[PDB]
Symmetry: C2
Subunit: 583 residues, 2 copies
């Protein structure tokens, strides 16, 4: 058929309403159900064909055609069934076309991840609210989140107390309790979300600090002798003050290396995991605490304690572990020594404001783990306006995800409340526009479909990149295209992130006022390589036909800096990924 | 030749040659270098022999000289030897001095020479923190003491009058004395004497001030609250740094560096200071992250993004060199990528950057962010936890910190008029260096200088595998390992080994001052996986062994399942060894 963006653009969105899948992640050889929601808004009956293509990078790996009639104004669902190929840890793009005669009149894509374990390609989201609600309402929220292929959900502030997560007892759980902020939590909603997430192969993570206890922790059987102190004379136990309307005036901190604290908190968590079928303990930390000491006055190097705590927790609970190393504090220790599923780094402002840090955090995770662990970043967008009733900026949110995803990272940002705007996950003062939601759908399809080019077996490339006529940088500098290259078996990959509209390289966009980047069309990229082993050159972008691969024209040339490919690029908006297939 | 045994020299080591040093900190190509040799015959017999001098560039002898000397028991003499510096710019040399009787060496001491037309490539930064009334002769002795370490720049810390008005008096009539920030008496003639004396040894002198600081009474000096930095968006609370109440101001109020009126004001004030006092550099300090901050009108200001513009505007307004302290790397990428600073300067702090890795990664970041165009100086104040007690620095932890910084291609600001830094307040001098630590620092600074071409000149990270069979190793300064990594340049590969086998927790600062001597590993093997076989020879130099003298190492070409490698025989590792492999 005649696939053309000339005439698809005229009637795009007017037949195919949505395309998505039944689960977030699939095991090799699973049945994948692709769900296509058709809504004929063409003001005219449709009598034609729905084509489906399954792509692995540039290659067609499967194809289906289905004859469909749908009346003007009618809605139909069409389910397509595909066996997941046998190779583990592979991403695919699914392209759907509505074809009349032999012209494509609509198109929408989704993605499929075939991974036996979430740990290689984490796509982490959150649930922050646990009110009384029907299983059907909960199912709709999980359905929404599943559209983004999120393969893990952090349940934030579900628990009863930091030192006693289970309300009631294992023999008789309390169906309703207060969380840390005196919100009502309903146990049946927690359980419903867990069951629903599991039906979509989504991991569910239980949030708690490593080392926190309420004001009345002595009443619950914890001891001051296990505490972390701000002086060597046990005068002042370290603590994190909270607002006066909350369930405790402060959280008192404990020494993670204290074996009695470990025994106490592991037993308390064991009770919680017995009642609520969580897969993961997401162990939060507060970062550096200044000079700290145990009860007996011995200095405690807090970061030095993390790995032992985390490994012992994994053993005690028989559950997966993730740890938040805030501002990378303890990242070296966790990445080298802890059996965590992946690395997790929250950025707490003002530091690490530069775009470069979005890449550098991921690079640090890769380097410190000898390439054995993936990295998730928490980077709260438009934080500067997070106390206003306002909107996320659709431009800066895309640039931040391009920066993180191109570096081989994941960004924890989507959840039940929409998107994160500050460290307190339930704070929902910023809302996503309809336009931003569409972009996030595309960006998450991209994150999934191109996981093998983004964070699978890659190394930094030394090969020189030039973009003649256009200012470039390797580190996210203002007024440049940010560009760099990576190499893996069978492919070289070049990223271009458009910061030509950026005056100041702050990824946060504190006023939520960034603008659309300038669009550059029909330009050249020069890529200097020695090897004459090129099969072809391709480009994919979440900004262009939701990640559909385009074959690029190129020439082999040579100048005063050596031999290079001159690559013709049709368009750059936010983020393009060029990939060069080797013979 | 003569019989140079370490056994025989070790019996009478230091009993004839008392010191060896030079007249200047840095030399221009083809300058006359004066090597000064202080003799003090403590042999309990008269000496009639020969002093030999060898000038070395890495493994190569580039010059030699000798002088016959008669010196009686108990006599002291100074010898002055002249050497023409070779024509090549940015080169380091080791100078080896031997006292020979008959055909045997009975004493040895080394120094180093740096031929550099500019301090910016190989900064060796120190400080002067005290400016009391004193004779030029006393000032000269202090400068001679600092010159022993080849310090090519000196930061004058808390010399100025006020942060918003550095010059006391007027350009035409400057005050002879004034109060500094801490109500200490500063004497202008001492400032001037140090500047003149420093310059006579080709040492750069840096004027310390904050980027954005004013006294409580800044309105009386012409500064305005409209230029200020604010902790809230309604200009209620101006950002400020509180000080002890006995100091000259209750607090320093902070200004917005991006404010063009603040820039004009402070650049004019600095211009007056520079007209009276012949400083070469403005050393611009910052305080690091200040939380979420705003201008007077309530517009948010991300401070780190204001630094580069400020510093470039400062350099243009003053016509002077600029250095900026980016505390805990806050602003480092901004300054390294966008500012015309002479080199990068990073004060780092535990607990966040306590791990030994941060000593290297700070230098790596500066190098990467500057596209390899700027060197990095690190401020990392040693034994801070005992710095309020009258005590000694721990000689073991100070050596390991310098090994870590120097091997990474960095410099450590630590030595000055008060001895060594133990706190961010440079005049605080409760910790003293023992005699043994001073000797180690002399060797380490000779090493920093003599091997600058292998430490921070044209190097790239190497992917070549290193193994040390039987010994735990790390690439990142982990506790209970030998920290090892490799670098490559035109003509050499370099392998560093830093001994953290005695370290329980990776923390460079040693806050209790209780680190112990590392274990000594003798006669061990290093495996260096190298695909090419074009190897001329393998060498080792260490500031711990024969005061940095190069030794040729035995090696074998071998292969196993991980590839071809060199098996290198290493006689000894104490704190830090540098293996260098000469390529064909
Ligand atoms: K005067």
């Amino acid at each position: 058929f005649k696939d053309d963006n000339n005439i698809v653009a005229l009637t795009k969105g007017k037949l195919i309403s949505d395309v998505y899948t039944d689960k977030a992640r699939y095991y090799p050889s699973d049945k994948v159900t692709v769900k296509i929601e058709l809504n004929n808004e063409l003001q005219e009956d449709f009598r034609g064909t729905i084509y489906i293509f399954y792509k692995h990078l540039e290659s067609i790996v499967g194809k289906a055609k289905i004859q469909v009639n749908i009346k003007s104004g009618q809605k139909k669902q069409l389910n397509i069934f595909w066996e997941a190929p046998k190779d583990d840890f592979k991403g695919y793009l699914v392209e759907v076309y509505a074809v009349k005669g032999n012209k494509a009149i609509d198109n929408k894509n989704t993605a499929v991840d075939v991974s036996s374990d979430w740990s290689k390609f984490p796509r982490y989201g959150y649930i922050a609210n646990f009110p009384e609600q029907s299983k059907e309402k909960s199912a709709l929220i999980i359905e929404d989140l599943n559209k983004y292929h999120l393969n893990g959900l952090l349940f934030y502030d579900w628990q009863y107390k930091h030192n006693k997560p289970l309300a009631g007892t294992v023999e008789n759980p309390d169906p309703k309790w207060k969380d840390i902020a005196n919100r009502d939590i309903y146990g049946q909603t927690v359980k419903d979300y867990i069951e629903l997430a599991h039906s979509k192969n989504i991991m569910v993570a239980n949030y708690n600090l490593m080392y926190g206890g309420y004001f009345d922790y002595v009443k619950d059987g914890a001891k001051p002798e296990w505490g972390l102190y701000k002086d060597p004379n046990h005068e002042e136990q370290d603590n994190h003050p909270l607002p006066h309307t909350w369930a405790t005036d402060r959280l008192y901190l404990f020494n993670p290396a204290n074996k009695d604290w470990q025994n106490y908190i592991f037993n308390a968590e064991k009770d919680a995991f017995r009642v609520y079928n969580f897969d993961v303990w997401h162990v939060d930390t507060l970062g550096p605490r200044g000079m700290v000491y145990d009860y007996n006055g011995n200095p405690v190097e807090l970061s030095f304690t993390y790995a032992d705590f985390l490994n012992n927790a994994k053993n005690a609970l028989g559950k997966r572990i993730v740890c938040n190393t805030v501002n990378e504090y303890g990242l070296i220790n966790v990445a080298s020594g802890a059996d965590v599923d992946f690395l997790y780094v929250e950025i707490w402002p003002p530091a690490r404001a530069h775009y470069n840090f979005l890449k550098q955090t991921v690079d640090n995770g890769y380097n410190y783990s000898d390439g054995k662990k993936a990295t998730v970043v928490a980077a709260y967008m438009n934080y500067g306006i997070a106390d206003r009733s306002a909107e996320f900026n659709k431009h800066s949110v895309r640039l931040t995800d391009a920066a993180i995803f191109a570096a081989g990272g994941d960004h924890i940002e989507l959840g039940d409340t929409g998107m994160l705007s500050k460290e307190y996950f339930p704070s929902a003062n910023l809302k996503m526009s309809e336009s931003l939601v569409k972009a996030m759908r595309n960006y998450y399809d991209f994150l999934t479909a191109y996981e093998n080019l983004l964070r699978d077996g890659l190394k930094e490339s030394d090969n020189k990149i030039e973009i003649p006529g256009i200012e470039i940088s390797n580190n996210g500098s203002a007024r440049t295209v940010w560009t760099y290259a990576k190499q893996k078996d069978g492919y070289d990959v070049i990223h271009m992130i458009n910061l030509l509209g950026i005056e100041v390289s702050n990824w946060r966009d504190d006023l939520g006022n960034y603008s659309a980047p300038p669009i550059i069309k029909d330009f050249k990229v020069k890529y200097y390589l020695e090897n004459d082993n090129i099969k072809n050159v391709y480009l994919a972008s979440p900004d262009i036909n939701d990640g559909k691969v385009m074959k690029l024209q190129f020439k082999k040339k040579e100048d005063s800096k050596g031999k290079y490919l001159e690559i013709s690029v049709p368009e750059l908006q936010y983020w393009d990924m060029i990939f060069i297939k080797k013979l």
